[PDB]
């Protein structure tokens, strides 16, 4: 039974993703909440290209506990309303909620597994989420987290230039991908997600970049700028500069204070500069410092 938008009641914005605002939704019939993703189409040039359908078309057949629920899709004039599973909180509301005391060790194992399953099931299946960062990660009240907002490879309607797309993005993104790689791989999920780790350790976003450049000065001023040794061939990548600053890497020890031996030497493996040697999702399961994981309720306050 087709749903029309005059069959949702606007409750509140929840969320500033990378087609704008989302919206918390009442389905005046049934009463459930939902979550709105509003995309407008611009039928121009030859209409929507197939390109653009064929990555969606992946992503519509994704199946899996840690990845939103798309209940339904709208389609109008020149718009298209995704009618999503309603989630509690996204990650980044939870850790700002939690900053003074942090996310406790055991959820943010929990988190970091259920994420890393996530990953697994959608580099298995051809599928890259490409911006990953806290406020597109959900959590809901029974303890899971689930991947949101993907983004593809090729543009599909009309962009929205906000703060959290043109700006957080980067603070989150795979090196290969600001030194101009030809194709990068799942690897650059894997960096984007050790970023997260870290962020929900320290309670503080490692690389808040306002520019690729700044990004990348960043990068190097922790981890230490990259060489030949490190990464074999990162001095031919296209946006490599030989004059770029060299700085020492710096400890994790020091980065992240709080994480023993084993939770260094996953963030480390999630951090590799050389995109080969980066750990693998399905690979970073098997870690030892998910020896002791569970499945804790968060506490969400509102
Ligand atoms: O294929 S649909 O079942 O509509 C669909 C289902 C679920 C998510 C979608 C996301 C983008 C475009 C779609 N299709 C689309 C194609 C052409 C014009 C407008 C929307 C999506
Ligand atoms: O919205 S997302 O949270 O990524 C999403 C979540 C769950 C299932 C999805 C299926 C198709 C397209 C999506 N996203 C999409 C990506 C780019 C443009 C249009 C739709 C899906
Ligand atoms: C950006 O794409 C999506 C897709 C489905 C979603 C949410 C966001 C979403 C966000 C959210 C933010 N705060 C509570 N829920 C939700 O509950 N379901």
Redesign the pocket.
Same mark, same amino acid.
């Given at each position: 039974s087709p749903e029309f938008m005059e069959n949702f009641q606007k409750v509140e914005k929840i969320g500033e993703g990378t087609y704008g605002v989302v919206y918390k939704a009442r389905n005046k019939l049934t009463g459930e909440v939902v979550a709105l993703k509003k $995309?407008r #189409?611009d039928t121009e040039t030859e209409g +929507?290209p197939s390109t653009a $359908?064929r990555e969606?078309?992946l *992503?519509?057949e994704l199946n899996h506990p840690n990845i939103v629920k #798309?209940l339904d +899709?709208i389609?109008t004039e020149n718009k #298209?309303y *995704?009618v999503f599973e309603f989630l509690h909180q996204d990650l980044k509301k939870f850790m700002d909620a939690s900053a003074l005391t942090g996310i406790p060790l055991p959820l943010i194992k929990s988190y970091l597994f259920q994420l890393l399953q996530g990953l697994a099931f959608c580099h298995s299946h051809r599928v890259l989420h490409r911006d990953l960062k806290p406020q597109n990660l959900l959590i809901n009240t029974e303890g899971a987290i689930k991947l949101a907002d993907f983004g593809l490879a090729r543009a599909?309607g009309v962009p929205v230039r906000t703060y959290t797309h043109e700006v957080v993005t980067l603070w989150y993104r795979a090196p290969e991908i600001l030194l101009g790689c030809k194709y990068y791989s799942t690897a650059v999920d894997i960096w984007s997600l050790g970023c997260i780790f870290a962020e929900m350790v320290t309670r503080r976003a490692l690389f808040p970049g306002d520019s690729e450049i700044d990004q990348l000065f960043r990068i190097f001023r922790t981890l230490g700028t990259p060489d030949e040794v490190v990464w074999p061939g990162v001095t031919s990548m296209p946006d490599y500069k030989p004059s770029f600053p060299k700085w020492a890497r710096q400890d994790f020890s020091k980065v992240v204070p709080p994480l023993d031996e084993d939770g260094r030497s996953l963030l480390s493996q999630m951090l590799h500069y050389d995109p080969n040697k980066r750990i693998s999702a399905k690979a970073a399961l098997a870690h030892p410092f998910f020896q002791d994981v569970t499945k804790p309720v968060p506490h969400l306050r509102l």
């Amino acid at each position: 039974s087709p749903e029309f938008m005059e069959n949702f009641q606007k409750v509140e914005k929840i969320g500033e993703g990378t087609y704008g605002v989302v919206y918390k939704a009442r389905n005046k019939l049934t009463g459930e909440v939902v979550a709105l993703k509003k $995309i407008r #189409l611009d039928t121009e040039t030859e209409g +929507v290209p197939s390109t653009a $359908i064929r990555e969606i078309s992946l *992503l519509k057949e994704l199946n899996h506990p840690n990845i939103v629920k #798309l209940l339904d +899709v709208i389609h109008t004039e020149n718009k #298209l309303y *995704l009618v999503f599973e309603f989630l509690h909180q996204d990650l980044k509301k939870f850790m700002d909620a939690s900053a003074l005391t942090g996310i406790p060790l055991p959820l943010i194992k929990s988190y970091l597994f259920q994420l890393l399953q996530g990953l697994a099931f959608c580099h298995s299946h051809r599928v890259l989420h490409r911006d990953l960062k806290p406020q597109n990660l959900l959590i809901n009240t029974e303890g899971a987290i689930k991947l949101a907002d993907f983004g593809l490879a090729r543009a599909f309607g009309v962009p929205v230039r906000t703060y959290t797309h043109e700006v957080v993005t980067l603070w989150y993104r795979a090196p290969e991908i600001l030194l101009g790689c030809k194709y990068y791989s799942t690897a650059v999920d894997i960096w984007s997600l050790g970023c997260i780790f870290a962020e929900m350790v320290t309670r503080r976003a490692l690389f808040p970049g306002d520019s690729e450049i700044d990004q990348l000065f960043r990068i190097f001023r922790t981890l230490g700028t990259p060489d030949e040794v490190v990464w074999p061939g990162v001095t031919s990548m296209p946006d490599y500069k030989p004059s770029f600053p060299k700085w020492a890497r710096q400890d994790f020890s020091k980065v992240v204070p709080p994480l023993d031996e084993d939770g260094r030497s996953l963030l480390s493996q999630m951090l590799h500069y050389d995109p080969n040697k980066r750990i693998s999702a399905k690979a970073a399961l098997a870690h030892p410092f998910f020896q002791d994981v569970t499945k804790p309720v968060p506490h969400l306050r509102l």
